[PDB]
Design a protein around this ligand. Structure first.
Ligand SMILES: [Mn+2]
Ligand SMILES: [Mn+2]
Ligand SMILES: [Mn+2]
Ligand SMILES: [Mn+2]
Ligand SMILES: [Mn+2]
Ligand SMILES: [Mn+2]
Ligand SMILES: [Mn+2]
Ligand SMILES: [Mn+2]
Lengths: 237, 237, 237, 237
């Protein structure tokens, strides 16, 4: 069914479905078993920042994750997205919790997409930046347990009144408008996404993670995609 | 029904419904009878550029229209858009033809909207830029006779195969995503729109015009809004 | 000598040279006696944000100052900067202390200037954004006691090792490159500046203030411009 | 002496100093003998567009050159610019002519540089865009025969009154302000440059080319750097 390209921030090592033995960042092309991963020194309760970049000349999806005053983790992968995704896609954020849990809070998110033609001075661009989410965010499609407005934040997975994270939860937020990633006469196509997140868990082994994904425009949360499946895939194939 | 704020480029003087005796630019707040107009020295077959700006501190909607190597026309109006439009709106371009006609071709369109909070470093922004339209532009809602892709342009009103403009036509194009123009804690809100257009008519008295508008998100072309009513209003009140 | 246009954040009421009886924001055109002022509820030790905007269609310099969780102060003034400043200018930040004092710390500064011609698709733009200053900031001209790099901040006026503010100090920081604010064929010219500042004083009556200014490119700190003269004017005329 | 990183658009094949047997695009790291080249189907008298991108995560300098309605040429090279250039550099355009010649006209140039820290929300950015050059362009350092203002264009090498290109000419234009390309705590550093050029020659074998370069901030045209040496290197080593 859905086509998914995601950058995952996987907090719980399910070494049974391929995770390394630690929290890691990975690049997933159509499967939960990452094509590439990097060790991520995850910090409970600290605000992190994820940066994701790509361009159709280099055909390399790269991601960098950092915490203030910390060394950063980075992961890269050669892949031609023209061969994996449709011409028009929707971009979004997803997260889940399972028997273990954590809060998956998004404090900001910006995205920029550009298509430059061979025509003199011809660039098509899309840019959005959210530094504050409101209770009725009409430019986002919220799926699952995702909600906006709490503390002006985006809560991807369920959190009780006190802000405690609930288990077995899954939620996604997609930017309302379709994004154009390929064009017949495009000489260069590129995108970059940035998001700041706060993962906090009362547990020692928090789970599952957060992912930035790009999918077919009509993507929806697959059945049984809670836990280790990050609200993105239907199975662990 | 609909709430409309538009900047019109009115090519045909219907002095019976308030137009001056010449082609003019005007600012319309909920009625086709402009609150303010400026004389516009319209050029048949030349590519023009319209710039529209506004900010919630000054509460002034201003518009500038120019042609290369020509003096420019400008029109301004004090108005607090918080008191006229809803919190969430859709922005778009509209055009019409009646017994007289012309081509209403859009070659490019960019829009930028920003909401800056009192929170340190908190700006929400939306920006889009089209320098090339494709036949299946999924981020635009096309209404009426508007079509995209011809010569990579946006044709707001009907044009025969040879590119001749048809009479009694009306079409609009709206950016797919809702735009947020007011926010509770916003200290400054602003927007700016730019579009380049080509108005060409085989006639001496071309009609009717083109307008940049902002409306409720569910706006649709009112009945009998061809001609002088610019695809925007239902009557000449 | 110098030509100065400044937006002042005046913390000390010198009602003898025209200040109101309280901390205020004012717009200064070539004299320290503001053309217009607004009451500013200044907060000791809180991080504030100043936004300044202008455009050559409206010919209105407006400024908004806010603190998180606070109502904001705003001040506006009709003025055609084409008639006051040269074609090429330098933009900067200035501050001073006198018998009373305070720290004048700048945590971030961004500026955007645009000149749009009547030529199709012809915009000249300059944009800079500093969210971190380094000890050897080669794109800034530092005058007086201004220094960079401390805590990655810009310190406009002298501060002892413990960060205590010194009296009788004056410093300015100017962006290295000249900025083009008018152009023969320009149909619209605009600029916007944003800066976040931290004013902290161990005193009850802190003094003097901070100002965003625009001046001739060879501007330098006038003699005896400490205190109430904000490092900008030579006298209180 | 100078440190040079350049993207060359080499119109004349000096196969004696390493050029392929045709017009090509190449990436030069400290020597005129390109580390990498691509065949470039050069078009006399047509307006081309060069796009150059780089980011410190991928450590790949890539360049794309196109003409309207033409297939584009692209060239890439893995190189860590932190190991080749200083922390602070100046960016510019250079060109030359020798016994053979051509006009080296620049119609537009934009550059964007960003440094993103590990600090939450901390980006330093520089952006400039010239779509029109004026006779007294105070934000550019012009060296050699480069001049501005003709037809609102930048003429890198000498052209007689009729616009005929002169031989043995060399000129460069550098953006006035120093650009910061590395920073201690930077997690990601990137830049992108775009320029449109018009190479026209009354000859069958036009020479020599144009190059986008990055150098030490005090770079100046080396002695005898006309012709094949592109105003960038002192010798063909
Ligand atoms: Mn896992
Ligand atoms: Mn994993
Ligand atoms: Mn009319
Ligand atoms: Mn009218
Ligand atoms: Mn004072
Ligand atoms: Mn004052
Ligand atoms: Mn050569
Ligand atoms: Mn070569």
């Amino acid at each position: 069914a859905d086509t998914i390209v995601a950058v995952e921030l996987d907090t719980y090592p399910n070494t049974d479905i391929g995770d390394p033995s630690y929290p890691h960042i990975g690049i997933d092309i159509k499967s939960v078993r990452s094509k590439k991963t990097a060790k991520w020194n995850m910090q409970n309760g600290k605000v992190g920042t994820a940066h994701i970049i790509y361009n159709s000349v280099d055909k390399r999806l790269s991601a960098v994750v950092s915490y203030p005053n910390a060394d950063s983790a980075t992961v890269s992968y050669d892949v031609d997205l023209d061969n994996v995704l449709p011409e028009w896609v929707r971009v979004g954020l997803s997260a889940s919790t399972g028997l273990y849990k954590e809060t998956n809070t998004i404090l900001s998110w910006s995205f920029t997409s550009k298509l430059k033609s061979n025509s003199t001075h011809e660039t098509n661009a899309l840019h959005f930046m959210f530094n504050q989410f409101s209770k009725d965010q009409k430019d986002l499609i919220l799926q699952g347990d995702a909600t906006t407005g709490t503390d002006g934040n985006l809560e991807l997975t369920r959190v009780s009144s006190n802000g405690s994270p609930q288990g077995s939860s899954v939620g996604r937020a997609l930017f309302y408008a379709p994004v154009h990633i390929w064009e017949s006469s495009a000489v260069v196509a590129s995108f970059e996404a940035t998001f700041t997140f706060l993962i906090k868990s009362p547990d020692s082994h928090p789970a599952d993670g957060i992912a930035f994904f790009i999918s077919n425009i009509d993507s929806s949360i697959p059945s049984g995609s809670t836990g280790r499946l990050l609200g993105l895939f239907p199975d662990a194939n």
